[model samples]
Target: HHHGSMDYKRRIHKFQAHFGKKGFEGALVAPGSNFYYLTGFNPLGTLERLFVLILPSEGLLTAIAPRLYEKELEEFNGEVVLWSDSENPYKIFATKIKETFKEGEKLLIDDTMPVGVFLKAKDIFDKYSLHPISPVISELREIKDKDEIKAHKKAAEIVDKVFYRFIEGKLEGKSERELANRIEYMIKNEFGADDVSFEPIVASGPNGANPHHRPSHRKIRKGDVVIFDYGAKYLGYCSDVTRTVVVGPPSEEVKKVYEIVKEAQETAVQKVAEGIPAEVVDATARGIISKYGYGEYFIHRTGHGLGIDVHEEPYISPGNKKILKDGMVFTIEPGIYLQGKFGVRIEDDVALVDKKGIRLTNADRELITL
Candidate 1:
C-alpha cells in the first residue's frame, strides 16, 4: 500500500496547468477540504473563527492563527501571513491581501465557499474589483488519477471483504445494529482504514424501506430482508458498495425486485463509456426499473461521482449535461424501496478508461439467501 503523499501535488500541478490555459491568475483557496487536498495540511479550527488563505500563483498562504494550530503553516510549500492574538484581524487580513493583489487584476476564488463568506469577501474587496471564479476545485477533482483509482480499488476490496465476513454468520443472531457495528469495527481494525465512508447502514426487513436507513437495535429475524450499504476510506479516497441479503429464503416478490435492480445497475454500468452524457446512463437504469413498475420506488438519482467526498460532481441524474470522461469514476446504485415493505439495491463502482469503464467491486450481486 502506498501512502499517496504526492497525489495532491500532482493534482495541484494539473489544476494550475488548466488555469494557465484559461489565462486566469491563479486559485485562491480558503482553509477547507480543498486546502487540505492541495497542501496535505488540515488545521483544526472553525471556518469563521480562522481560515488559511492561499494564493497559488504567488506561492502565498496566510492564516488567522488560533493558538490551537499556529505551526501547521510550516509544512506548506508557500509563503504565509500569520495573524495571531488580535481581536480585529480584518485590517491585517485586508492589508496582507491588498499587498499581494494588484488593482483590477483578475484572481480566482473558490466557488464552493458559502454565500455568506462570498459576501464578506465581496465587501472586503469592493475597491479592487476582485472576480469570483466559480467551481475551480470541483473541476479539478472531477477526474481521478491512476494512483487515486488504485487507492479506491484497495478500499473497495476492503469493503467487499467486510461484506463477506458479515455473510459468514458473524451476524447470524445479532441485532442489525450489532452487526453493523461488527462490520464497522472490522473495517477499521482489519483493513487499516482511517474511517468509514459513511455510517455503516444495517437496515433489516421493514427498516430497509429507507434507502439510507441508519442502523438500529432491531434484531434480524428469519424471513427478513437485509440491506447493507457501507464504504471504506483509504488515503483520503472513498469506496461505496451495497448488497442485499435475505435472512431466510427470498420471497418471490424479493426475487423479482432484486432481479430488476441488479439489471438496472448493470445496465447503468455498461453505459458509462467516455463521451457518454451522464444522463443517458441514468436513463438506461430508469428505463428498466420503470418498465417493471418500480420507478416511483427509485426516488434518488441513479448515481453520483465518488472521490474525496462520497457524493461529488458529474452526478448521474436525468438533467445532468456533463459528459463522462476517461478518468471519471463513480457508482451506479440502482435501488427499489417499497415503503413499509422491503428494499433492494445493487451498487458498483466503475472507472472510465480511454474508451470503456472498468468495474472495481467484483462482489456478486446475485440475490443471496443467507
Candidate 2:
C-alpha cells in the first residue's frame, strides 16, 4: 500500500480494465518512479528499498519497507508489512506475498523490475507462475492526465522564461559552469520549481558539438555556439528543451546546420498528429537531415517522451512504433553534430492535445547572433 493522489486509483482501474478482461494477474508494484507514479508515496529510498504492492480489483494493497519507516508509512494511505535490517527483508517479504495468494495463482512482475528481483524469488515462486505484462503501468502513464498536463505546462513555462531571461541578457563572458548554475538556481528558486528535470547543459564553443556536454569552467567567448539545454520539475512532472545560440556572428556552416536542424524539428512537430506512429515523427526529422547529407552526424533519436521522468513511453526513435495520442508530451530535438567542429540542435517540448500537436516550449528557435 502506498499514498494516494499519485493516480494509484487510475493504475488499479486500468489494471482491472485490461487485466480482468485479459485474465492476467494483478500488477506487482515495484520501487521506482513507476511505483511513485502509481502511488503518491515518493520516497527516494524506494530506489534502494521499499516496495509497494497494489492488487487490482479491490484487493489488498501492501507495502514492504524498513522497520524504521513504520511511522512514515502511517502517513501513507496503504496497508504495510515492515521488516527490519536484522531480517532477510526480501525473504520475509516473499513469504508474505505467497501467503496472500492461492497455490498456483499467477502474479505479474512489472517488466521494469530488474532481473535481480526475479532471480531472488526464483525458488520461492516455482510453483506459481510469474508473467511479464507489457505497458500496463507505462500505458497508463503515457497520456498525461489533466492535472499532470497543468503541472507539465507550468514546468515548461518556467524553463521557457528562464531561457528567455538568459538569452535577453546575452550570457557571454561568464564561465559555462556559472551560466548553468545561474539558470538552474533561477528555475529552482525564482520560478518555484520543485526540482530540476535534469542536469543543466551549458556547452559553449566546440563543446556544443557534444550532445550531453557538461558545463565547463572555460570562459564563454565570441564566435562560439552556446547550447543551453535543461528543464525544471513541477509536482513530479518534468520538462525538457534545448536552444543553440551564437556568441557572435554565425559561421556559414553553423548557420546551415542550424537551419536544417530547425527545419527537421519543425517537420517532426508538424507530423505529430494523434494515431501517427512515433517512429514516423522521428523519421520526419531524420529525413530532413538525411537530405542535407548529415544523416550520419545526427547521432541520436529525434526526441523522447517527457513527464514524471524525463524519458518515458512512446519514445521518438527510429525503431519505436508506438502510436502518438492526445496527452502524449515529448520533445522534438533534431541535431547535426559535426565531429571536431561545431554542431546545432533545436529542442522543444511538444505535446499532442485534442488530436493535434502543440509546441509547449516557446523559446526562440531562430538563429540568434549574440
User: Would you estimate the TM-scores of all the predictions?
Assistant: 0.88, 0.88
**Per-candidate local distance difference test:** 0.77, 0.79
Per-residue CA lDDT of model 1 for 157-273, tens digit only, reads 888888777788745668877888888888897556878998788889899899768888888888788988889988778889989989778889998989999899998898888
Estimate, for each residue in 5-111, the C-alpha lDDT of model 2 and write its tens digit.
55666666666677666555566767667666766556555445545464644564677777876776786556787877677777876677666766576667766
**lDDT score, candidate 2:** 0.79
Number of colliding residue pairs in model 2: 2
Best by lDDT: 2
Superposed model 1: Cα runs more than 4 Å off: 1-4, 7-10, 17-26, 56-67, 86-91, 104-106, 111-123, 128-134, 170-173
Error of 1 at 83 (Å): 4.0
Residue pairs clashing, model 1: none
Model 1 RMSD to the real structure? 3.1
